[PDB]
Amino acid sequence: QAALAVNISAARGLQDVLRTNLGPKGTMKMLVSGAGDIKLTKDGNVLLHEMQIQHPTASLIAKVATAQDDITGDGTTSNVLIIGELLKQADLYISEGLHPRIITEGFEAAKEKALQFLEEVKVSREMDRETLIDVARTSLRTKVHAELADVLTEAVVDSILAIKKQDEPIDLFMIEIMEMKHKSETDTSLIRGLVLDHGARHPDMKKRVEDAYILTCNVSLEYEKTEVNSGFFYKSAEEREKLVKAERKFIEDRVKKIIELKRKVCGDSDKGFVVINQKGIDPFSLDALSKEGIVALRRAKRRNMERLTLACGGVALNSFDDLSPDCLGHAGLVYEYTLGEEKFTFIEKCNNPRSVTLLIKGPNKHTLTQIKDAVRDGLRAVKNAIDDGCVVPGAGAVEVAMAEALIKHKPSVKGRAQLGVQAFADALLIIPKVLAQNSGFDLQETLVKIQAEHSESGQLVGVDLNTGEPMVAAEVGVWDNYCVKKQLLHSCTVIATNILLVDEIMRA
Amino acid sequence: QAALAVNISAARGLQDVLRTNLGPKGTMKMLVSGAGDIKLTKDGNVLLHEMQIQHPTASLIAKVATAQDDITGDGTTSNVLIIGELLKQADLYISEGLHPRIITEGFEAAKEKALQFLEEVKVSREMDRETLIDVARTSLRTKVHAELADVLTEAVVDSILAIKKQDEPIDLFMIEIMEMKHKSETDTSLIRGLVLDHGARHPDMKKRVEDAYILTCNVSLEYEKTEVNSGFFYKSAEEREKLVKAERKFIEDRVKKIIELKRKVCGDSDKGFVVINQKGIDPFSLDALSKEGIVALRRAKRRNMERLTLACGGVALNSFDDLSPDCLGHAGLVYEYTLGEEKFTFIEKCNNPRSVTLLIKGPNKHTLTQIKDAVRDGLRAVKNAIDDGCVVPGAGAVEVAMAEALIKHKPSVKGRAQLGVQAFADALLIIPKVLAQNSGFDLQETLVKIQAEHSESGQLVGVDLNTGEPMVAAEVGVWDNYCVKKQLLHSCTVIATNILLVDEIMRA
Amino acid sequence: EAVYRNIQACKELAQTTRTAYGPNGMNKMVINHLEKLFVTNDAATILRELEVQHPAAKMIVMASHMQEQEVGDGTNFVLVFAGALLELAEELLRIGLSVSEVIEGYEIACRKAHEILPNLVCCSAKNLRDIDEVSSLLRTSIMSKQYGNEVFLAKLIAQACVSIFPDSGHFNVDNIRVCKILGSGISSSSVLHGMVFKKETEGDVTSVKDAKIAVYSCPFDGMITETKGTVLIKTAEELMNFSKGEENLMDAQVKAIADTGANVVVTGGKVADMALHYANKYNIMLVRLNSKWDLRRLCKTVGATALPRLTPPVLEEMGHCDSVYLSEVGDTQVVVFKHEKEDGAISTIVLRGSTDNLMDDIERAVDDGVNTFKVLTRDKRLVPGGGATEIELAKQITSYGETCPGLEQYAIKKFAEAFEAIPRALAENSGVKANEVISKLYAVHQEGNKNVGLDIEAEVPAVKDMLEAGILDTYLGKYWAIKLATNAAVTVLRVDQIIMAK
Amino acid sequence: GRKVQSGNINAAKTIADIIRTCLGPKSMMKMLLDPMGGIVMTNDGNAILREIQVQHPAAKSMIEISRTQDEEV
Amino acid sequence: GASTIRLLTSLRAKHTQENCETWGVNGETGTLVDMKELGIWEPLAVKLQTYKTAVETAVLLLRIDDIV
Ligand SMILES: Nc1ncnc2c1ncn2[C@@H]1O[C@H](COP(=O)(O)OP(=O)(O)O)[C@@H](O)[C@H]1O
Ligand SMILES: Nc1ncnc2c1ncn2[C@@H]1O[C@H](COP(=O)(O)OP(=O)(O)O)[C@@H](O)[C@H]1O
Ligand SMILES: Nc1ncnc2c1ncn2[C@@H]1O[C@H](COP(=O)(O)OP(=O)(O)O)[C@@H](O)[C@H]1O
Structure with a gap:
């Protein structure tokens, strides 16, 4: 019993650590590493990934909860909080001659009732612009400022509306994130296509390349000097001292190849042909290429190449010549853009534009990582919301609803499992009351008010987080994912099981 | 400042000390006096006089419990457990920042509902001997060894039946328990009429006397010409010879007074007048009046004389002289009993014979004192049963029913007093809980079982300690007093408030 | 916790009193508040001096005093048997069974023992004359306290009691006084009217x-x-x-x-x-x-x-x-x-011996003999002793426990093992290992002989029939010994805490 | 009844008390606290035995005879 | 989580009756069950080996005296 009590106490400690993070109006946590760089994060999954926790069972809880929550969006904060409360309620009887297994089967029966209850409690609503705005809000507000989240919603939802055309549960193949520092954070917008973090040494470019033919093969407009001729520093290094030079001709030869392909694909020197390089390219030849209607770019990173191939056609290769136009794509507008000091060239309106990207413009690193995490959370949450056909309102509404359902189900479950379903109901009650505590409205008063509102009317009613009054979460626009919350309840029951069964501490 | 935590801990400690004592199946406890003697007991009344209370507010709870239970005295232990469970749930709810005064308001509302529902729980009937012996059995068995309880209970119900004419409560004047040390209990039944603290015996004296008249004498051999009875005038010879006169002069004059009384009233002593002499007397009277009709008694205390004044008519005239032949008391039958070592006088069928006595006889000292306390508590409980025809099913049945009633009334209660009445119901759960733990059951399956039985049917089901399975307490015969339950709820609520409303405990 | 503490205290009391049980009991030094030093093997005196300050120990000791004042023999049987009850109840509670179940089981087992023991008796005392026969009946009680010189005291007590025992079926406890004038030779004692x-x-x-x-x-x-x-x-x-x-x-x-x-x-x-x-x-x-x-x-x-x-x-x-x-x-x-x-209604004997310590030993022997005569006069039936009756009861109680389904059987079996503890007490005192002799005694006793017990005279653990051997206790003596021993055990087990009051 | 057999019995009791909860369909989870900081979960007794530390030689011999048992069946 | 002593004692009392040798404890529900009725079964060989090896290791272990 001592080891079970110790495990429960440690889980309650980390539960108290995570208590204050849940809800938009909830105090933050920010980490510091050995190097001293800070990390602002109200997210739970990255938090448990990166926290240093003294306790052990806390370590296993964090590891397993994050591993199983990654599959189901982001819900691990509520998971840890509810399992901590459930462990509290379990201990409140384990101290009175309760054997873990009966409490576990009580939780299992409560889970069996609660999933089937949520089946008819989730509301079948058609996906549209407004509901996805609402779910994007309810996801983003849990990580960033309310006004800042409102700014994010448009981009984060419109990217998903763009990719929705595939009508299949496919994600992360596109909609990659793009980051840059800026003086004002408020600017943060989606970009159809992709964003290149570089440009080229092209003075007075025809920056508005609208007839942007694309073929993203690597052109060696700066040939890497052939220092290797006969090995390392033997007596034959006299060849290396001279063969390192005379690479100037290959730049112009490759440029002539690009000019030939430019002639082939456009029939003239007018329409802009855009090509890439993995390494640097000379400015002197770029001066002529900008006059020839040729746009070569340099210092490209790896995955962006095949991403352009998928979004706008073309192929990427290191060996280069006047390749046949067997894959020539065409971007509708390579929106060359620059603000601050660095050139970030946009690629948009690709021919049948597959990919999208989200340009987030956090002023500095500790805000940029926050905004990144917020965007990932919002995108994955709305992807889950479009994965299922129903979206269930949150804000502690369905939690009190299923808690009251389990209270009414108490006689239906036979035997000593009744305490199990009772403790499970209290664990579900922790959520609305912890939202009230985080907002500050005397959590228990808000809990009794919301339960009174639910009982008298039967309407699925949640807590209005900014005023404490019980409000219909569907009407307020607070929505939680059915898949996320389903796997949330699964994870809660499973890890609570695991923690009740453990009874011994082994030095091995 | 949660200084009320120490008061709750003190309530926990006193609950644990008063735990294990409920029910016939529960254990008893011994009170080792400072003199080193032994005192076995089970009732909480004297357990809360265990002056090693070890903590001051625990002493507060003990003394207030004794004061509020002395009115009924059938409900004292249970009170400690109900207040302990109220304070347990109160601690469970303070631990989340909730203020205790609304908890006390919820307790008050719960009490207001519980008394009204108890008024419907009680059954009302004419107290026939069967139900009366059942309630006496179920009240006394929880304090005495089971095999010995019934022989006491029959004498208890006989005692309470002897005074049925008028609604007056228990009074010691009609029921005076009397004890003497003996080898075996051997049917410790009452005797009708009054029993004397001692007796006088002589081989020629009479065993049984019928139609015996009675008077008393404070002075019959000691002093002369004065009403004083104190140390002889060794310091004054002039007043000393009167004190050797006194014995002869009064054993002459007052003895002839008795014999002329018995000759004129009875027709030469045919009715056998008897006299209770309050102290020692010269053997001239004792060893010679044995044949002279008169039964002279010796070494009786005053309380015996007021008891017999109430029990035989007339008055125990401490002045010897038979100033009126109709001032005599009368006895219908007299029996000078002798058992074990010592002899005692019975008087029976006296004028106003409604006074009876209890021969509480058995093993010496601590068993005798425990039997005395137990029979007193049983007589007070049967008093509570007779005073109002209301009887409630004990064995935890009434607490289960009240808990379910308050659970059903919980949604009707507005505000956090809903939580208060929840705490009150879960506290009333303790009586089945303590009873079930006392007989060594799983205890958490007993409570669920009894609640399920009370929820499936309308029966007033309680725990039977001999089997643990739920069974209707009504036809089993384990009754309880409605009045002690009313007082139990009142005292419990008032002291739970008065202890939970402490704050910033400070020394005086 | 306090239950285990009370059981431990009573266990150590029964252990320190057990060594004097049986004829070959081990003496102990006694130093009362008169500071006189003497050796004795009597439960009554050894407890009367031993300050049993633990309240549970005091409870068992006063139960023994009540047994002694009601009946002569068995005052040490009560101690050792209550100790066995408490050790086995501690074992049951360590298993996890509640106090209520074990006390109720002990009560029902005591009732069964009181019901079946009258069937256990094998002989009844004949007329109290014929000094030889009453000597043979006192044999067990006289040997119980003093050993090596035993027949003389039996004859002495028999003559003393019979010379004063009236024709009426009554005899008084305060009959035989003892006079302890010093001098050589125990055998020189005699009785006078x-x-x-x-x-x-x-x-x-x-x-x-x-x-x-x-x-x-x-x-x-x-x-x-x-x-x-x-x-x-x-x-x-x-x-x-x-x-x-x-x-x-x-x-x-x-x-x-x-x-x-x-x-x-x-x-x-x-x-x-x-x-x-x-x-x-x-x-x-x-x-x-x-x-x-x-x-x-x-x-x-x-x-x-x-x-x-x-x-x-x-x-x-x-x-x-x-x-x-x-x-x-x-x-x-x-x-x-x-x-x-x-x-x-009074007869007095003269005690002869060279030491006041041996004088007191003879005094306790005389007291136990005359009390045995008391309890024989009013209950002429009397039980075969020397471990035989305790084990016959043990076997019957084991059969009853197997006969009783459900719970309460733990207490029945441990009550039978408490019976089993008596010939263990005889074995440790007699210099034979307890387990071997108790197992051999079961081997010879489950066969139905019903009168076999621990043979002291054999240097090797062995058994003999006590009926013809002359070892046999009083029926009422063992009846009340077990009755108040179980009462003491059930009362002490019913105390879950030791609490002081002022 | 020398002290060595008592130590043998004590080691056997400790290891059996550790293993007991792993029996039956409703067997408990067990905690393995590797001093590196991680935890290994286990439902059945063989897994916990394969890595439990037994510093007492009696328990170590119990583990060896358990190995002898488990290699056969 | 059942009554470890009470229900096991009931199982033993059932086993005191003939033809009840099949009666046992249901691990899934913690109540007594005629295990022939559930259909959960177990072979002779593994149980024989289990008891044989258990008594063998007991015999080996309690005969030991430990000396470097
Ligand atoms: N604007 C809002 N008003 C009330 N509740 C909200 C709001 N936004 C989010 N919530 C609540 O936040 C809960 C989950 O948020 P959270 O667990 O912190 O996100 P994550 O697990 O991804 O870190 C949901 O139950 C939801 O009801
Ligand atoms: N024969 C019985 N069987 C079961 N329960 C009983 C029985 N007799 C009394 N009780 C229960 O025990 C309680 C009364 O005893 P108790 O509280 O110890 O009285 P007191 O306050 O004088 O100590 C009540 O809850 C009653 O229901
Ligand atoms: N000759 C004997 N052989 C074996 N046991 C005996 C013999 N005599 C007496 N006993 C045992 O001793 C018991 C009585 O002696 P004991 O208890 O030691 O002292 P006391 O009679 O004062 O209580 C008997 O109940 C009996 O069991």
């Missing part, structure tokens, strides 16, 4: 007929209520004058106060030897060097009462007797008061 005393002032017995007794611890006056006469020790010549005076007062006593019941005066304080000479001349004897209990015994057995200070004698405190005469038993003068059932 009526009471005897060890040694006093010399005298020529003239009260050999119509004997009456006066008793003064106060100045040696003995005046009759109709006259005034006293001795005041302030000067010699008038002291002799008084000595003559109260000698004439003693003559007036034996003349007139004899009708009330005073001939011979018992003196608590020493008187001058010349006054003893005057008593010799005028034919009045007296007794000296008697403890206050001796005066109480002599006065009660004649109906008299000791006077604390000077008071004229009255019929309220007169003593009656048939004869006061003398005998030189053991080559030493002893006075004897003889009765013809006018009061009577």
Whole structure:
């Protein structure tokens, strides 16, 4: 019993650590590493990934909860909080001659009732612009400022509306994130296509390349000097001292190849042909290429190449010549853009534009990582919301609803499992009351008010987080994912099981 | 400042000390006096006089419990457990920042509902001997060894039946328990009429006397010409010879007074007048009046004389002289009993014979004192049963029913007093809980079982300690007093408030 | 927790008392508040000195005292058996069974034992005459306390009790007194009708007929209520004058106060030897060097009462007797008061031995023998002892436990094992390993012989039938021993905490 | 009853008390606290035995005879 | 989580009756069950080996004296 009590106490400690993070109006946590760089994060999954926790069972809880929550969006904060409360309620009887297994089967029966209850409690609503705005809000507000989240919603939802055309549960193949520092954070917008973090040494470019033919093969407009001729520093290094030079001709030869392909694909020197390089390219030849209607770019990173191939056609290769136009794509507008000091060239309106990207413009690193995490959370949450056909309102509404359902189900479950379903109901009650505590409205008063509102009317009613009054979460626009919350309840029951069964501490 | 935590801990400690004592199946406890003697007991009344209370507010709870239970005295232990469970749930709810005064308001509302529902729980009937012996059995068995309880209970119900004419409560004047040390209990039944603290015996004296008249004498051999009875005038010879006169002069004059009384009233002593002499007397009277009709008694205390004044008519005239032949008391039958070592006088069928006595006889000292306390508590409980025809099913049945009633009334209660009445119901759960733990059951399956039985049917089901399975307490015969339950709820609520409303405990 | 503490305290008490159980019990040193040192093997005295400050221990000890005052033998059986009950109840609670179940099981097992033990008895005492037969019946009780020299004490007690046991079916416990005058040889003891005393002032017995007794611890006056006469020790010549005076007062006593019941005066304080000479001349004897209990015994057995200070004698405190005469038993003068059932019902023996410690050992042997005679007179049936009855009960209780389904069976089986603990107590004391002898005893006893027990005389653990061997206890003795032992066990188990009160 | 057999019995009791909860369909989880900081979960007794530390030689011999048992069946 | 002593004692009392040798404890529900009725079964060989090896290791272990 001592080891079970110790495990429960440690889980309650980390539960108290995570208590204050849940809800938009909830105090933050920010980490510091050995190097001293800070990390602002109200997210739970990255938090448990990166926290240093003294306790052990806390370590296993964090590891397993994050591993199983990654599959189901982001819900691990509520998971840890509810399992901590459930462990509290379990201990409140384990101290009175309760054997873990009966409490576990009580939780299992409560889970069996609660999933089937949520089946008819989730509301079948058609996906549209407004509901996805609402779910994007309810996801983003849990990580960033309310006004800042409102700014994010448009981009984060419109990217998903763009990719929705595939009508299949496919994600992360596109909609990659793009980051840059800026003086004002408020600017943060989606970009159809992709964003290149570089440009080229092209003075007075025809920056508005609208007839942007694309073929993203690597052109060696700066040939890497052939220092290797006969090995390392033997007596034959006299060849290396001279063969390192005379690479100037290959730049112009490759440029002539690009000019030939430019002639082939456009029939003239007018329409802009855009090509890439993995390494640097000379400015002197770029001066002529900008006059020839040729746009070569340099210092490209790896995955962006095949991403352009998928979004706008073309192929990427290191060996280069006047390749046949067997894959020539065409971007509708390579929106060359620059603000601050660095050139970030946009690629948009690709021919049948597959990919999208989200340009987030956090002023500095500790805000940029926050905004990144917020965007990932919002995108994955709305992807889950479009994965299922129903979206269930949150804000502690369905939690009190299923808690009251389990209270009414108490006689239906036979035997000593009744305490199990009772403790499970209290664990579900922790959520609305912890939202009230985080907002500050005397959590228990808000809990009794919301339960009174639910009982008298039967309407699925949640807590209005900014005023404490019980409000219909569907009407307020607070929505939680059915898949996320389903796997949330699964994870809660499973890890609570695991923690009740453990009874011994082994030095091995 | 949660200084009320120490008061709750003190309530926990006193609950644990008063735990294990409920029910016939529960254990008893011994009170080792400072003199080193032994005192076995089970009732909480004297357990809360265990002056090693070890903590001051625990002493507060003990003394207030004794004061509020002395009115009924059938409900004292249970009170400690109900207040302990109220304070347990109160601690469970303070631990989340909730203020205790609304908890006390919820307790008050719960009490207001519980008394009204108890008024419907009680059954009302004419107290026939069967139900009366059942309630006496179920009240006394929880304090005495089971095999010995019934022989006491029959004498208890006989005692309470002897005074049925008028609604007056228990009074010691009609029921005076009397004890003497003996080898075996051997049917410790009452005797009708009054029993004397001692007796006088002589081989020629009479065993049984019928139609015996009675008077008393404070002075019959000691002093002369004065009403004083104190140390002889060794310091004054002039007043000393009167004190050797006194014995002869009064054993002459007052003895002839008795014999002329018995000759004129009875027709030469045919009715056998008897006299209770309050102290020692010269053997001239004792060893010679044995044949002279008169039964002279010796070494009786005053309380015996007021008891017999109430029990035989007339008055125990401490002045010897038979100033009126109709001032005599009368006895219908007299029996000078002798058992074990010592002899005692019975008087029976006296004028106003409604006074009876209890021969509480058995093993010496601590068993005798425990039997005395137990029979007193049983007589007070049967008093509570007779005073109002209301009887409630004990064995935890009434607490289960009240808990379910308050659970059903919980949604009707507005505000956090809903939580208060929840705490009150879960506290009333303790009586089945303590009873079930006392007989060594799983205890958490007993409570669920009894609640399920009370929820499936309308029966007033309680725990039977001999089997643990739920069974209707009504036809089993384990009754309880409605009045002690009313007082139990009142005292419990008032002291739970008065202890939970402490704050910033400070020394005086 | 407190339950285990109480069980441990009673366990150690039963262990330190167990070593004296059985005939070959182990003695122990006793140092009371009189600081005298002696060795004894008696449960009553060893507990009466041992300060059992633990309240549970005190409870079991006073239960043993109640058993002893109700019935003679078994006062150590109660201790060892209650200890066995508590150890096995501790085992059951360590298993996890609740106190209520074990106490209820012990109660029902005790009821079963009381129900079946009357079927266990094998013989009943014949008529209490024929000193040989009553000696054979006292055999077990006499051997229980003293061993090596046993038949003599059995015959002594038998003769003493039968010579005074009246024709009526009643006998009184305060019958046999003991006189412990020192001298060589236990075998030189003898019985006399009526009471005897060890040694006093010399005298020529003239009260050999119509004997009456006066008793003064106060100045040696003995005046009759109709006259005034006293001795005041302030000067010699008038002291002799008084000595003559109260000698004439003693003559007036034996003349007139004899009708009330005073001939011979018992003196608590020493008187001058010349006054003893005057008593010799005028034919009045007296007794000296008697403890206050001796005066109480002599006065009660004649109906008299000791006077604390000077008071004229009255019929309220007169003593009656048939004869006061003398005998030189053991080559030493002893006075004897003889009765013809006018009061009577008293017989007294003389104890002979070279040490006061052995004197007390003989005293406890005599007490247990006479109490056994008590309980035999009113219950003439009596039980085969020496481990036989305890194990027959153990086997019956084991069968009952297998017969009882559900719970309560743990307590039945452990109650049978508490029975089993008795021949273990015999085995440890007798120098034979307990487990081997108890298993061999079951081997020979489950076969139905029903009268087999621990054979002490065998140096190897073995058994013999106690019926023909003469080892056999009283029925009522074992009945009440087990009854109050189970009562003590159930009461002590019913205490879950030790609490102090003021 | 020398101290060595008592130590044998004590080690056997400790290891059996550790293993007991792993029996039956409703067997408990067990905690393995590797001093590196991680935790290994286990439902059945063989897994916990394969890595439990037994510093007492009696328990170590119990583990060896358990190995002898488990290699056969 | 059942009554470890009470219900096991009931199982033993059932086993005191003939033809009840099949009666046992249901591990899934913690109540007594005639295990032939559930259909959960177990072979002779594994149980024989289990008891044989258990008594063998007991015999080996309690005969030991430990000496470097
Ligand atoms: N605007 C809002 N008002 C009330 N509740 C909200 C709001 N936004 C989010 N919530 C609540 O936040 C809960 C989950 O948020 P959270 O667990 O912190 O996100 P994550 O697990 O991804 O870190 C949901 O139950 C939801 O009801
Ligand atoms: N024969 C019985 N069986 C079961 N329960 C009983 C029985 N007799 C009394 N009780 C229960 O025990 C309680 C009364 O005993 P108790 O509280 O110890 O009295 P007191 O306050 O004088 O100590 C009640 O809850 C009653 O229901
Ligand atoms: N000759 C004997 N052989 C074996 N046991 C005996 C013998 N005599 C007595 N006992 C045992 O001793 C018990 C009585 O002696 P014991 O208890 O030791 O002292 P006490 O009679 O004062 O209580 C008997 O109940 C019996 O069991």
